[PDB]
A paper describes a structure:
The co-repressors SKI and SKIL play important roles in a number of different cellular processes including proliferation, differentiation, transformation, and tumor progression. They are dimeric proteins that interact with both phosphorylated SMAD2 and SMAD3 (PSMAD2 or PSMAD3) via short motifs at their N-termini, and with SMAD4 via a SAND domain (named after Sp100, AIRE-1, NucP41/75, DEAF-1) in the middle of both proteins. Upon TGF-β/Activin signaling, SKI and SKIL are rapidly degraded by the E3 ubiquitin ligase, RNF111 (formerly known as Arkadia), a process that requires SKI/SKIL binding to PSMAD2 or PSMAD3. We demonstrate that the SGS mutations in SKI abolish interaction with PSMAD2 and PSMAD3 and this results in an inability of SKI to be degraded in response to TGF-β/Activin signaling.
To discover why these eight amino acids were so crucial for R-SMAD binding, and also to understand why SKI and SKIL only recognize phosphorylated R-SMADs, we solved the crystal structure of the SKI peptide (amino acids 11–45) with a phosphorylated homotrimer of the SMAD2 MH2 domain, produced in insect cells. The structure was determined by molecular replacement and refined at 2 Å resolution and readily explained why the crucial amino acids identified in the peptide were required for SMAD2 binding. The SKI peptide binds on the outside face of the MH2 domain at the so-called three helix bundle, comprising helices 3, 4, and 5. The N-terminal helix of SKI packs against helix 3 of SMAD2, and the C-terminal portion of the SKI peptide, which contains the critical Gly34 and Pro35, forms a sharp turn that is stabilized by pi-stacking coordination between Phe24 of SKI, Trp448 of SMAD2, and Pro35 of SKI. Moreover, the NE1 of the Trp448 side chain forms a H-bond to the main chain carbonyl group of Gly33, which in turn positions Pro35 for the interaction with Trp448. Furthermore, Glu270 in SMAD2 provides a pocket, which has a negatively charged base that ties down SKI Gly34 through hydrogen-bonding to its main chain amides. Other key interactions involving amino acids identified above as crucial for binding include the main chain carbonyl of Ser31, which forms a hydrogen bond to the ND1 of Asn387 in helix 3, and the hydroxyl group of SKI Thr20, which forms a hydrogen bond with the Gln455 at the end of helix 5 of SMAD2, and is nearly completely buried in the interface. The two leucine residues (Leu21 and Leu32) that are mutated in SGS are both buried in the structure. Crucially, this conformation forces Trp448 into flattened orientation, which is incompatible with SKI binding through the pi-stacking involving SKI Phe24, SMAD2 Trp448, and SKI Pro35. As a consequence, Trp448 moves into an upright position in the trimer, allowing engagement with SKI.
Author numbering:
A (entry chain A), C (entry chain A), D (entry chain A): 266 to 467
B (entry chain B), E (entry chain B), F (entry chain B): 15 to 41
Write the structure that this text describes.
């Protein structure tokens, strides 16, 4: 297998509750904001305010009005950061981040306005990828979760909150890191197949 | 095998970059 | 904030009932048709006949067969028009249009075959945008609805019909006007935040 | 009506059960694989392993782990082939294929690992298109089904299986052939409208 | 009419190609 | 402030165009 460098360092999908809303945003510049405004043609702004959803109700709509300046996402070397530009907090679930601090990988971290958090470190990811090959195909396969980061605007979820899953928050986004996914692919294509058999029938 | 080379190459590329195998291959 | 001219003057999303179907169409040419045929690679034709939906039932399918030549959408200066090329009528809900004639902004206008209707006037929009700043952030924020226009093929909805919402019509489209959305963004980014507080918890 | 050659010979949509997942893949190269891995930026690989679905359950997840090398799709002249590279079989529903062998057009064919099957022959399609004009608009209109091919990974469906519809399989894809769809469009635009009337009201 | 020409042209283009009417038009 | 200038500029651009602030900025 051969590889070409991704034109986009990440891709971002927006969600309301359990429903995907709008097109996937593909990020070509190393810094970008996901905000609640309405510029449709800026390669550095994923503007959520112009996305329609005939099905959305009042909780989602009030929340959307509070995204505001939203979240700034950028990378420096092999490290990815999120900065809360919104007047309201944002809540991040990054397995790579959680493993760094010894937390459960489903832990949700709160970012108050004006603060930033390192949500991904590639060097820690490479180390985990190196160890996963000793665990078999399925172990490597799950590492895609290390390359996906989920973030909710305004509303928290998890142990400290009444909302328990990300699909219960009104306004959230799903970030995929394309560089690390390519390195994962280079390993997966050399791992064989899983040992347990699937029948065509079951 | 090729797995060990891939991991060694990624452990090195990852210390300061987010790029994939192509970017590394063009060091 | 700085701006680059949108490559596409509008974007169009297709729907069946309450379900979004197919990819968003992005319009680069100042005139285009949304029709019921099947050319996949024409920058001037959004062809609905080739969109699949394993979930659709017979009402949607019979309707799709009657879209035919569909609707032609074009702008002249700062004015956007829809022309019914279909043998069946199309039904338009354009707040900008409704405000022009003093109608409720949810009013639905019927366009018989061979007729056209001016569904947007930018100069009226600029005036409304100018007045909205005196009403606060949320008032400006709602003006995205002025930039979205919804249209149903064949089947009407609203007061004069049995179908009461657009999500009850089998075949409809959602148009976003990107130029006006950029001017809205230029104002929104200077409006501050809403006054009512959202908690992370509620 | 005039035509420009499609940049992409086909487009592919991925599904889990009755839910569409991920972006549509547009194929510019005459050979491509749809696999279960994670390279996000290869014009010859539609990689399903990196697609997220917060809603998916365990059956879909175990299945995804068995896609593996997946399916290779390529055309030679006016003929399209699918080759099972996966360690598990793939199951194909191609009306064009089924008509060739005199089967019901909803018949599902099983492709064991290492085998290939000619899923489309354009010359047979042209002949059917030629005959359909004598049957009226609706008959030509249905021929889009000849240009769509559905394929399930690992799990079968239909008469020989417990799953009865494609929406019951955990992991399947929907292929659209863009060249044949353009020829269909060239005919449809010359067929008039259907004879049965739709009212705006019913 | 133009239907007969379209079908004749497609019956010929389809014997060895997957291209649409534009590709044929440029034989 | 900058709001008044934005509105004045849009009231003028909108009388005959659908373009955004960039197109206007390049009058």
């Amino acid at each position: 297998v051969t590889y070409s460098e991704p034109a986009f360092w990440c891709s971002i999908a927006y969600y309301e509750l359990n429903q995907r809303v709008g097109e996937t945003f593909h990020a070509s510049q190393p810094s970008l904001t996901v905000d609640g405004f309405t510029d449709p043609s800026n390669s550095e702004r994923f503007c959520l305010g112009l996305l329609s959803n005939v099905n959305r109700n009042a909780t989602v709509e009030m929340t959307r009005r509070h995204i505001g300046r939203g979240v700034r996402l950028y990378y420096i070397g092999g490290e990815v950061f999120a900065e809360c530009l919104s007047d309201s907090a944002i809540f991040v679930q990054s397995p790579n981040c959680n493993q760094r601090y010894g937390w459960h990988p489903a832990t949700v971290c709160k970012i108050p306005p004006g603060c930033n958090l390192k949500i991904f470190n590639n060097q820690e990811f490479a180390a985990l990828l190196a160890q996963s090959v000793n665990q078999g195909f399925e172990a490597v396969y799950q590492l895609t979760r290390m390359c996906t980061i989920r973030m909710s605007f305004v509303k928290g979820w998890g142990a400290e909150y009444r909302r328990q899953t990300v699909t219960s928050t009104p306004c959230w986004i799903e970030l995929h890191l394309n560089g690390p996914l390519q390195w994962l692919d280079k390993v997966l294509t050399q791992m064989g197949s899983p040992s347990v058999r699937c029948s065509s029938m079951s | 095998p090729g797995l060990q080379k891939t991991l060694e190459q990624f452990h090195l590329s990852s210390m300061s970059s987010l790029g994939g195998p192509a970017a590394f291959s063009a060091r």
